[PDB]
Design a protein around this motif. Structure first.
Motif, PDB file in Angstrom:
ATOM      1  N   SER A  90       0.852  -1.193   0.000  1.00 12.20           N
ATOM      2  CA  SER A  90       0.000   0.000   0.000  1.00 12.20           C
ATOM      3  C   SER A  90       0.869   1.216   0.000  1.00 12.20           C
TER       4      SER A  90
ATOM      5  N   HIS B 206       1.088   5.589  -0.466  1.00 11.93           N
ATOM      6  CA  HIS B 206       0.557   6.870  -0.826  1.00 11.93           C
ATOM      7  C   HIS B 206       1.552   7.985  -0.911  1.00 11.93           C
TER       8      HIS B 206
ATOM      9  N   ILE C  73       2.517  11.557  -0.433  1.00 14.86           N
ATOM     10  CA  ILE C  73       2.195  12.416   0.698  1.00 14.86           C
ATOM     11  C   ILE C  73       1.401  13.707   0.324  1.00 14.86           C
TER      12      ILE C  73
ATOM     13  N   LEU D 236      -3.198   7.168  -3.555  1.00 19.36           N
ATOM     14  CA  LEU D 236      -3.239   5.849  -2.884  1.00 19.36           C
ATOM     15  C   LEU D 236      -3.232   4.616  -3.830  1.00 19.36           C
TER      16      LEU D 236
ATOM     17  N   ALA E 211       5.120   7.147   0.759  1.00 19.66           N
ATOM     18  CA  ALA E 211       5.298   6.179   1.887  1.00 19.66           C
ATOM     19  C   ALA E 211       4.563   4.880   1.529  1.00 19.66           C
ATOM     20  N   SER E 212       5.167   3.715   1.875  1.00 22.65           N
ATOM     21  CA  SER E 212       4.629   2.400   1.520  1.00 22.65           C
ATOM     22  C   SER E 212       4.754   1.430   2.727  1.00 22.65           C
TER      23      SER E 212
ATOM     24  N   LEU F 192      -3.206   9.804   7.668  1.00 26.19           N
ATOM     25  CA  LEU F 192      -3.721   8.840   6.726  1.00 26.19           C
ATOM     26  C   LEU F 192      -3.220   7.449   7.107  1.00 26.19           C
TER      27      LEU F 192
ATOM     28  N   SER G  49      -3.380   3.320   6.349  1.00 13.17           N
ATOM     29  CA  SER G  49      -3.752   2.196   5.485  1.00 13.17           C
ATOM     30  C   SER G  49      -3.555   0.920   6.237  1.00 13.17           C
TER      31      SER G  49
ATOM     32  N   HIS H 140      -4.249  -3.426   6.368  1.00 15.97           N
ATOM     33  CA  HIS H 140      -4.859  -4.643   5.922  1.00 15.97           C
ATOM     34  C   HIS H 140      -4.692  -5.823   6.828  1.00 15.97           C
TER      35      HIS H 140
ATOM     36  N   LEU I  69      -8.691  -4.514   3.289  1.00 15.58           N
ATOM     37  CA  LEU I  69      -7.976  -3.233   3.095  1.00 15.58           C
ATOM     38  C   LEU I  69      -8.771  -1.956   3.484  1.00 15.58           C
TER      39      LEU I  69
ATOM     40  N   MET J  84       5.974   8.865  10.711  1.00 17.87           N
ATOM     41  CA  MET J  84       5.634   7.588  10.132  1.00 17.87           C
ATOM     42  C   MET J  84       5.338   6.639  11.229  1.00 17.87           C
TER      43      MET J  84
ATOM     44  N   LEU K 271       0.099   1.228   8.095  1.00 18.33           N
ATOM     45  CA  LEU K 271       0.990   2.399   7.926  1.00 18.33           C
ATOM     46  C   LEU K 271       0.198   3.667   7.990  1.00 18.33           C
TER      47      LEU K 271
ATOM     48  N   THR L 276       0.811   7.826   7.944  1.00 14.76           N
ATOM     49  CA  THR L 276       1.600   9.025   7.710  1.00 14.76           C
ATOM     50  C   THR L 276       0.853  10.204   8.280  1.00 14.76           C
TER      51      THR L 276
ATOM     52  N   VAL M 173       1.093  14.307   9.074  1.00 13.43           N
ATOM     53  CA  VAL M 173       1.636  15.614   8.643  1.00 13.43           C
ATOM     54  C   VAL M 173       1.200  16.727   9.592  1.00 13.43           C
TER      55      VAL M 173
END
Lengths: 177, 177
Positions: free
Chosen positions: A28, A30, A32, A36, A166-167, B26, B28, B30, B36, B150, B168, B170, B172
């Motif tokens: 996954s 996105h 920044i 996505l 970021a993944s 944000l 993500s 799974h 997901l 992160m 994950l 992220t 800001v």
């Protein structure tokens, strides 16, 4: 025994040795920096013989003596992104690991890029800094279980406007078959 | 200067001090274990006064002397998941940090759960192990920049069938306004 205590003493060569195998990956990502993406892949990780052409050519390119290499693996992958049907992403690379210290060193890969820099953290986490002209990447890789690898990565790119991506990838080892 | 070298000497109290602020998150996730989810959140992280009711009550509950606490923050969040419109997820917790060593210790939180266990890795990564009856979580948190956090986490749950979820986030920092 308990896997977590065992990781904190894993050497980088053991880390690579455990990575050998076939894996099913879910990544996954996105931007920044506000997108996505989902990428599903198969990844084959294999050991690399001392006489392997790719191995010696990488060593040659960077002028490292191949006998001083601690470890080398080949990674091949095939996957698809949900940003594109009718399309497959295929890739292959050889990685070559050198120690400057027990828990720090350099990583060379197939091509010319700056050498990668790696550390094995006290808890068993493999941390890699990789470079490109276009970009720089930092990846943290560790075994959540013997058969489940986690990879959390960030990339700074510059293809037009500068962008941070970021993944998180979760990699599951191919079942017994 | 260069941020990365500065992180590798960050103390855990500095880590918490830099976390104070307002963030846009944000996440993500799974299910490994094959779902997901995307969760967008606002998170407010604030300092906690020595006389704060929540702070002292947590200390009381675990029988820790509040004067021995190194740091305490309050986190409040509001977000939504793409698994559900017309719905908002709201939460709040106080965290309380104790050192057993400079780079290792315990984390107490609002409630009774086992105490959390944390380490500050050599590179500035905050690694937290948290526990529940239902579950156990391990989180790695670090500053990719001063204004970009992160968080890569894995949770083992047991609500019916046992399940591993990997995430994950992220985060800001709220722009200058």
């Amino acid at each position: 025994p308990q896997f977590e205590k065992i990781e904190g003493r894993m050497s980088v060569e053991e880390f690579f040795e455990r990575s050998v195998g076939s894996w099913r990956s879910l990544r996954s990502s996105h931007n920044i920096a506000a997108q996505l993406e989902e990428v599903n892949s198969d990844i084959d990780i294999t050991q690399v013989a001392a006489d392997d052409s790719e191995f010696l050519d990488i060593c040659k390119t960077y002028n490292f003596e191949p006998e001083k290499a601690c470890s080398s693996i080949r990674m091949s992958w095939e996957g698809s992104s949900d940003w594109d049907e009718n399309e497959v992403i295929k890739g292959s690379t050889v990685l070559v690991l050198y120690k400057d210290e027990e828990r720090k060193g350099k990583l060379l890969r197939s091509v010319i890029p700056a050498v990668g820099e790696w550390t094995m953290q006290e808890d068993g986490t493999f941390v890699l800094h990789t470079f490109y002209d276009r970009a720089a990447a930092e990846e943290r890789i560790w075994f959540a279980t013997p058969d489940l690898r986690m990879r959390c990565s960030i990339i700074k790119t510059q293809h037009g406007k500068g962008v941070l991506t970021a993944s998180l990838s979760t990699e599951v080892r191919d079942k017994s078959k």
